[PDB]
XYZ file of N, CA and C in Angstrom:
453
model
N 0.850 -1.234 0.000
C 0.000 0.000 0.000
C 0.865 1.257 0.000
N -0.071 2.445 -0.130
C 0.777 4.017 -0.067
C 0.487 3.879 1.401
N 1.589 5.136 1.597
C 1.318 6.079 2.772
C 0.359 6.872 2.764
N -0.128 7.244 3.963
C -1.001 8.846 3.616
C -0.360 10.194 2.487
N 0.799 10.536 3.266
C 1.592 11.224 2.291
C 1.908 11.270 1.067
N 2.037 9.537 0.679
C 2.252 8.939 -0.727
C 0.615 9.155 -1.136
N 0.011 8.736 -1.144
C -1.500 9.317 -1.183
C -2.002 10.736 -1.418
N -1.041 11.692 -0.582
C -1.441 12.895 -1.153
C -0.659 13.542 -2.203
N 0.250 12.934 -2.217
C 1.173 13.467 -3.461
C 0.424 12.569 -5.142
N 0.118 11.885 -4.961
C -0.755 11.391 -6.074
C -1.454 12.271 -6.063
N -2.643 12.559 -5.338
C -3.784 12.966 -5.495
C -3.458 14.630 -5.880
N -2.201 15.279 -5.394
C -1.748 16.584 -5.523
C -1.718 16.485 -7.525
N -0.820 15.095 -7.636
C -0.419 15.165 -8.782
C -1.621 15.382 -9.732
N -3.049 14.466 -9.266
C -3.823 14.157 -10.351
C -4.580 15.554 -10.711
N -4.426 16.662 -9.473
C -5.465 18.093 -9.993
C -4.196 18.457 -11.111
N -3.234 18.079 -11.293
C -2.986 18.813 -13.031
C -3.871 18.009 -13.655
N -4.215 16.728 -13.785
C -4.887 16.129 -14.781
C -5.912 16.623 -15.029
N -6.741 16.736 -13.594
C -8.273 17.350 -13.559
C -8.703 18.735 -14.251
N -7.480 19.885 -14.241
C -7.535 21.158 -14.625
C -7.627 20.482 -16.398
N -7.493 19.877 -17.102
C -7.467 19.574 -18.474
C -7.645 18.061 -18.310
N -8.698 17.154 -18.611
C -8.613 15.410 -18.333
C -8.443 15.076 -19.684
N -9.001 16.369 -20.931
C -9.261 15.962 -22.091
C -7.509 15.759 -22.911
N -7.112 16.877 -22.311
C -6.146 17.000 -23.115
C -4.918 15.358 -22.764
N -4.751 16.140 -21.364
C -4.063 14.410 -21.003
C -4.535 13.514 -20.802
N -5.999 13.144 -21.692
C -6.358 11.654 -21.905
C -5.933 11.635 -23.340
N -6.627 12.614 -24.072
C -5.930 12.302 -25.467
C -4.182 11.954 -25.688
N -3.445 13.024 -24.449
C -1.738 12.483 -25.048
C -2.115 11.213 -24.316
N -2.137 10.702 -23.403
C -1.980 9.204 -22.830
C -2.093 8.405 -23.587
N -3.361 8.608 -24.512
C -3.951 7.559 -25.400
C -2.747 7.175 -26.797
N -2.548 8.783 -27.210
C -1.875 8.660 -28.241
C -0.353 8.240 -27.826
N 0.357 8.663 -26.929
C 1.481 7.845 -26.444
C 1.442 6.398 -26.497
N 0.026 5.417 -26.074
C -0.108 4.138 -25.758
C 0.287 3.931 -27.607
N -0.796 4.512 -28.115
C -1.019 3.242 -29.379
C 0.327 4.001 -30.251
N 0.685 4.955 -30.061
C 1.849 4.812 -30.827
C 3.166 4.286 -30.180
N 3.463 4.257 -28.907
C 4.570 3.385 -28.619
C 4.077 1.857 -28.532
N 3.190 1.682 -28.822
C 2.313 0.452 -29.240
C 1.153 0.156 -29.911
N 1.354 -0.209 -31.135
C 0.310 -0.310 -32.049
C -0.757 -1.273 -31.687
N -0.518 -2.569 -30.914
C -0.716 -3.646 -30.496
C -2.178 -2.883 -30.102
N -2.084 -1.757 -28.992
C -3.419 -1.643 -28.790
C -4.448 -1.048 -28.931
N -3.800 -0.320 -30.157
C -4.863 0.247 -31.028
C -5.832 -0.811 -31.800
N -5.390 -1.947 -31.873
C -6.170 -3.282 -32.366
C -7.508 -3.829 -31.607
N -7.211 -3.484 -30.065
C -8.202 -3.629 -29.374
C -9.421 -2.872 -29.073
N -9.601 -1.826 -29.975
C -10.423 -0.532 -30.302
C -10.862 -0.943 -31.137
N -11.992 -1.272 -31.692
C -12.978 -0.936 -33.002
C -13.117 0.194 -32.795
N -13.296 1.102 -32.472
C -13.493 2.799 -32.338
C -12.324 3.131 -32.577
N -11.133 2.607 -32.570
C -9.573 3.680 -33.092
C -9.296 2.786 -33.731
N -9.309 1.560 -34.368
C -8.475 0.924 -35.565
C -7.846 1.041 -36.831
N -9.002 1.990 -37.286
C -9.223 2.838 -38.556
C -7.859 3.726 -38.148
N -7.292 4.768 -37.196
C -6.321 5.563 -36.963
C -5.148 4.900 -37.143
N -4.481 5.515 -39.054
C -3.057 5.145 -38.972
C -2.666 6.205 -38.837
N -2.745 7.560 -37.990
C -1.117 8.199 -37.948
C -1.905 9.410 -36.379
N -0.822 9.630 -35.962
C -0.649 10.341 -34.998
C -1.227 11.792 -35.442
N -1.521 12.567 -36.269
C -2.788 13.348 -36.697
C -3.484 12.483 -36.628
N -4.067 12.085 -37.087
C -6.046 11.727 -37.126
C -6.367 10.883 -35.358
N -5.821 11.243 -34.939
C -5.552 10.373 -33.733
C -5.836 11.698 -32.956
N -4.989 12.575 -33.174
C -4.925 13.881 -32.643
C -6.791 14.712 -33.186
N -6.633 14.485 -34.789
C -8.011 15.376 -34.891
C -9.318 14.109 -34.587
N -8.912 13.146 -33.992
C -10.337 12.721 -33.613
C -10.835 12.996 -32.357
N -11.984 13.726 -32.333
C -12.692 14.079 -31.330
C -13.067 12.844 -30.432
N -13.413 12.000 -30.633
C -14.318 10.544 -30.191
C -13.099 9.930 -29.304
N -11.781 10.351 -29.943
C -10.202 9.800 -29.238
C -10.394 10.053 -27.941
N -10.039 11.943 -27.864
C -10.242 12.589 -26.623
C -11.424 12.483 -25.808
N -12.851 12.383 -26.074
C -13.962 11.933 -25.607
C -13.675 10.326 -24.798
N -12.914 9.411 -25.474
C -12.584 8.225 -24.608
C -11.228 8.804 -23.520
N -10.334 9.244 -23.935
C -9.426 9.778 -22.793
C -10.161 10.402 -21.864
N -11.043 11.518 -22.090
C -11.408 11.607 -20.516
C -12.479 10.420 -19.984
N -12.855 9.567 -20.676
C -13.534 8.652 -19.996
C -12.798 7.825 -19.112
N -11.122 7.078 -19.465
C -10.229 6.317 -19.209
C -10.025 7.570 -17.788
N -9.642 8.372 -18.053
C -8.807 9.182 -16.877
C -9.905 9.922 -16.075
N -11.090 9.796 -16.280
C -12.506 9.767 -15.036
C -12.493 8.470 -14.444
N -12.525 7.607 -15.252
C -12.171 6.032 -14.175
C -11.384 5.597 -13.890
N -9.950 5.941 -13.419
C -8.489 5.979 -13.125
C -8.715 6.941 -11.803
N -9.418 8.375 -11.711
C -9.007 9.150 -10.766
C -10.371 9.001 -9.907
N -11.412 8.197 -10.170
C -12.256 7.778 -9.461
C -11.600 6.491 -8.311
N -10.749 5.773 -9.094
C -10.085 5.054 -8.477
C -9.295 5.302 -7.188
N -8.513 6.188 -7.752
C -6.914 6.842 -6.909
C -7.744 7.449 -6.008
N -8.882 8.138 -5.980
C -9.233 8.620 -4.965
C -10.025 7.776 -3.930
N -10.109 6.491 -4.206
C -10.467 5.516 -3.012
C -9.284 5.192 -2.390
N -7.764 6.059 -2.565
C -6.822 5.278 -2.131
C -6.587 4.114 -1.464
N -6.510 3.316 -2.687
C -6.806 1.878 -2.304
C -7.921 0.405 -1.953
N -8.906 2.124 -1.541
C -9.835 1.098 -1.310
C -11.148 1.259 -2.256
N -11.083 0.518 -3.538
C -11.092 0.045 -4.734
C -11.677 -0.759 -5.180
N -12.240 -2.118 -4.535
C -12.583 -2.914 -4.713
C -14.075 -3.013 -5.743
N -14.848 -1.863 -5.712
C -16.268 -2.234 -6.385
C -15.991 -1.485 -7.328
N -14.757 -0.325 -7.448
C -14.587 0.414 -9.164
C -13.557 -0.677 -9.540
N -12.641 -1.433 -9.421
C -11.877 -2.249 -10.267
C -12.796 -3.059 -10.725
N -13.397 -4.008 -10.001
C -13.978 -5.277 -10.056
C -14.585 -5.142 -11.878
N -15.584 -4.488 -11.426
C -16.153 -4.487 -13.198
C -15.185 -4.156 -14.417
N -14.066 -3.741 -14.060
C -13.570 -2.684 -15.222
C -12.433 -4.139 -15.565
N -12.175 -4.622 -14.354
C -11.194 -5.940 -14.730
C -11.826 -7.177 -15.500
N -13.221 -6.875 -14.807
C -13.991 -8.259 -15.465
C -14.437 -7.388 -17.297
N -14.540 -6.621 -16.956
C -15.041 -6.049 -18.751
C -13.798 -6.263 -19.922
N -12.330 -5.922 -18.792
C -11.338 -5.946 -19.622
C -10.601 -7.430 -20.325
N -11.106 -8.555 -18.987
C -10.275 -9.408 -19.367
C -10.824 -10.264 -20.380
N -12.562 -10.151 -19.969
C -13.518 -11.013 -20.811
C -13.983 -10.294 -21.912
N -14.529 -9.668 -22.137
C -15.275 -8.922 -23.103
C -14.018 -8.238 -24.179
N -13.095 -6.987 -23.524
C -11.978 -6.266 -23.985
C -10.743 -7.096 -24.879
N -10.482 -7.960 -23.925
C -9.371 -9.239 -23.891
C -7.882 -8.540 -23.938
N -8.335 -7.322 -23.186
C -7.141 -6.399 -22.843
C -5.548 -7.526 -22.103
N -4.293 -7.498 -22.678
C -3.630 -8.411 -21.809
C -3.061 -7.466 -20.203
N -2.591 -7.687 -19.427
C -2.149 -7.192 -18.456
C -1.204 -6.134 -18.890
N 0.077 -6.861 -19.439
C 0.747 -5.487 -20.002
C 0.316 -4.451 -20.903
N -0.585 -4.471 -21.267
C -1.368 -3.321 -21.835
C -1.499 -2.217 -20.717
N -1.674 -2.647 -19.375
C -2.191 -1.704 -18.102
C -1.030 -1.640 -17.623
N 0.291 -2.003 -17.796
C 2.173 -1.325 -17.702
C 2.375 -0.436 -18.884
N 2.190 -0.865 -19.965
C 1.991 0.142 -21.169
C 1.340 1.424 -20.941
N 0.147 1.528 -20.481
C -0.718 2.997 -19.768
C 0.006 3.841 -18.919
N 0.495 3.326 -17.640
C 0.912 3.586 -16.715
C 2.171 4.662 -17.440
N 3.075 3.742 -18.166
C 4.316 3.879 -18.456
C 3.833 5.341 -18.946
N 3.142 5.249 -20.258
C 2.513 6.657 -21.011
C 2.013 7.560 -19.894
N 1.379 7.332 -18.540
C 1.029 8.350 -17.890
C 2.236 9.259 -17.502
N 3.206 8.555 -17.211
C 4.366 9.091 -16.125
C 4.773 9.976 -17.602
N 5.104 9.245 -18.534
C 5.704 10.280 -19.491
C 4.912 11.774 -19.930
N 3.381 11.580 -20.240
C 2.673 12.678 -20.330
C 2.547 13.893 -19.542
N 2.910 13.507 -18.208
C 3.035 14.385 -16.899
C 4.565 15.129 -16.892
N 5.324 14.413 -17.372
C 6.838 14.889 -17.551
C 6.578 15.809 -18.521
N 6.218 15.237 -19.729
C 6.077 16.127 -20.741
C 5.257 17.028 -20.784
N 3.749 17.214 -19.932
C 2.859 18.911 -19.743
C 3.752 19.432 -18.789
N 4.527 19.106 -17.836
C 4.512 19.931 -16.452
C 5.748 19.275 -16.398
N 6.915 19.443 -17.347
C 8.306 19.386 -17.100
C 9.208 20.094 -15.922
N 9.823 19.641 -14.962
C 10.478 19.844 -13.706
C 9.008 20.341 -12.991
N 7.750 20.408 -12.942
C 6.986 20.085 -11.812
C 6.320 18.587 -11.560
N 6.692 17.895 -11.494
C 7.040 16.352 -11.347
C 7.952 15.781 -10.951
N 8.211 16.191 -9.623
C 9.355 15.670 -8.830
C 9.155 14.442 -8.009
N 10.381 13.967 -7.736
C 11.056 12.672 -7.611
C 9.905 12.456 -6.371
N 10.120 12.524 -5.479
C 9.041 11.878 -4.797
C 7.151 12.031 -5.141
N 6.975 12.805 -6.200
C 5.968 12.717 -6.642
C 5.374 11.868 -7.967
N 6.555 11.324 -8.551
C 6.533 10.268 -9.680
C 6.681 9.123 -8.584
N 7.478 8.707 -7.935
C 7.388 7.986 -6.860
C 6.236 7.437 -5.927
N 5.602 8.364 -5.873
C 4.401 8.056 -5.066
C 3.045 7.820 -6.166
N 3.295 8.029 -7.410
C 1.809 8.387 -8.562
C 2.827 6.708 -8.930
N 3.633 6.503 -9.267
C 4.045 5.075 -10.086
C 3.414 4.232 -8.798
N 3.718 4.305 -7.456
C 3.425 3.094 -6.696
C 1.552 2.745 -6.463
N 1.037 3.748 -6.806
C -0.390 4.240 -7.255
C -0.367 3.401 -7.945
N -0.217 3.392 -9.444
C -0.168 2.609 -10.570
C 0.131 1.472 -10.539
N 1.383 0.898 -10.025
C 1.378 -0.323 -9.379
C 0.162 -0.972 -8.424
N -0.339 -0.434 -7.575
C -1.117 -1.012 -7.048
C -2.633 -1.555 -7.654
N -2.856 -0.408 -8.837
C -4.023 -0.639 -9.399
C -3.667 -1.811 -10.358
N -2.516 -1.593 -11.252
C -2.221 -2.781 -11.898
C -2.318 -4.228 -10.926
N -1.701 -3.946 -10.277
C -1.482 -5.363 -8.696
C -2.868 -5.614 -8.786
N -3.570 -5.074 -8.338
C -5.257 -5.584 -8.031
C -5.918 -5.718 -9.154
N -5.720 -5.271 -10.280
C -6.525 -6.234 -11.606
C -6.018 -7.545 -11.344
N -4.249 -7.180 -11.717
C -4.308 -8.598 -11.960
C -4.352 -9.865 -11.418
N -5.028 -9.852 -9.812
C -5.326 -10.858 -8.945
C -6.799 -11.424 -9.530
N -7.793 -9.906 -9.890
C -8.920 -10.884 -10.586
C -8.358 -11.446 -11.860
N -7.695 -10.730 -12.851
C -7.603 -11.523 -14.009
C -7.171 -12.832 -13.763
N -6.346 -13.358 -12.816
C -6.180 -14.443 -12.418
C -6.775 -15.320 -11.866
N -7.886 -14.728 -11.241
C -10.049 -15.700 -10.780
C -10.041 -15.618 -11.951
N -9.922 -14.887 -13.490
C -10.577 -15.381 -14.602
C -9.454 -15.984 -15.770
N -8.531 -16.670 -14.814
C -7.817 -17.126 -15.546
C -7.210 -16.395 -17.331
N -7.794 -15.264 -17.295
C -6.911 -14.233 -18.559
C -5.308 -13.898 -18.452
């Protein structure tokens, strides 16, 4: 688990997200499928997107980024205690989505970079520190259900 402290430095971190969710859901998104194409495959709604413009001018893109990063900071703000917002989102992902696990290290990875890259040197070391062990934990607790569903 976090600390309290580690807890508030996430949660410090996530009001940059909140002041704009659209914008840094759209870079998150577009970081994922272009440092990995792999999961742009798992989108019928982005498949059609071969290039980093049309990715950028699709509205429907950014409309799913802030959906992804409304149910991420709905999360973080149960610090930890999580259990009835994961549950569905793991069972939608592993069965229905067929999202693999590293797909949700792939995200993560793109978050930390997107935050570096809006808010360069305000993202300090114990505050990437405390938002990665965040991320870890949410990853950690999918993947105990994906493992009840054997995915």
């Amino acid at each position: 688990g976090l600390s309290d402290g580690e807890w508030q430095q996430v949660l410090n971190v996530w009001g940059k997200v909140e002041a704009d969710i659209a914008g840094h859901g759209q870079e998150v998104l577009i970081r994922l499928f272009t440092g990995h194409p792999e999961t742009l495959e798992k989108f019928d709604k982005f498949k059609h997107l071969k290039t980093e413009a049309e990715m950028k001018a699709s509205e429907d893109l950014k409309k799913h980024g802030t959906v992804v990063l409304t149910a991420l900071g709905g999360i973080l703000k149960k610090k930890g205690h999580h259990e009835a917002e994961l549950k569905p989102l793991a069972q939608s992902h592993a069965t229905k989505h067929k999202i693999p696990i590293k797909y949700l290290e792939f995200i993560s990875d793109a978050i930390i970079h997107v935050l570096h890259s809006k808010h360069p040197g305000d993202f300090g070391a114990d505050a990437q520190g405390a938002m990665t062990k965040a991320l870890e934990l949410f990853r950690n607790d999918i993947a105990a259900k994906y493992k009840e569903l054997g995915f």
